[PDB]
Enzyme design. Structure first.
Site, PDB file in Angstrom:
ATOM      1  N   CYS A  38       0.866  -1.167   0.000  1.00 52.77           N
ATOM      2  CA  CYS A  38       0.000   0.000   0.000  1.00 52.77           C
ATOM      3  C   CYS A  38       0.916   1.234   0.000  1.00 52.77           C
ATOM      4  O   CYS A  38       1.536   1.542   1.018  1.00 52.77           O
ATOM      5  CB  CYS A  38      -0.907  -0.117   1.234  1.00 52.77           C
ATOM      6  SG  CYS A  38      -1.680   1.407   1.810  1.00 52.77           S
ATOM      7  N   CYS A  41       0.343   3.818   2.616  1.00 51.95           N
ATOM      8  CA  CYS A  41       0.742   3.318   3.939  1.00 51.95           C
ATOM      9  C   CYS A  41       2.233   3.560   4.150  1.00 51.95           C
ATOM     10  O   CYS A  41       2.661   4.017   5.225  1.00 51.95           O
ATOM     11  CB  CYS A  41       0.462   1.819   4.047  1.00 51.95           C
ATOM     12  SG  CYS A  41      -1.265   1.335   3.908  1.00 51.95           S
TER      13      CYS A  41
END
Ligand code: CL
Ligand code: K
Length: 118
Positions: A38, A41
């Site tokens: 991600c 992230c």
């Protein structure tokens, strides 16, 4: 400190112990539910660790990689999107912020959440 590393959560038993310790201190905690694929992230991590330093001794910050930890731990957060930044207190999730946009702006929304519950 200028930055404080988020502590990984190993499993549901570890989360239980983390919440018992937070209860002893009458403090909330922050959990960053993330994934290593991600990109947002990953980009958020240094900004979260800067925010964690601002709350050193007041709010412990944790992280959990949803692909690596046991499925039972992810279910404790009721996660559906990443990154999900949750504030827990008194053994349960009190609020959360969903990232998925510029890291600085996610951080300001997390800061607002912290102000509400700290
Ligand atoms: Cl588990
Ligand atoms: K959810």
């Amino acid at each position: 400190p200028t930055s404080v590393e988020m502590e990984p959560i190993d499993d549901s038993h570890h989360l239980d112990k983390i919440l018992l310790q937070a209860r002893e201190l009458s403090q909330p905690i922050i959990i960053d539910w993330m994934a290593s694929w991600c990109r947002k992230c990953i980009y958020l991590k240094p900004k979260l660790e800067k925010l964690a330093a601002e709350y050193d001794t007041k709010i412990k910050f944790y992280c959990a990689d949803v692909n690596k930890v046991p499925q039972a731990l992810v279910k404790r957060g009721n996660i559906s999107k990443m990154p999900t930044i949750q504030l827990w207190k008194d053994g349960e999730m009190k609020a959360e912020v969903i990232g998925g946009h510029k890291a600085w702006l996610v951080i300001e929304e997390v800061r607002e959440m912290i102000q509400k519950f700290v």
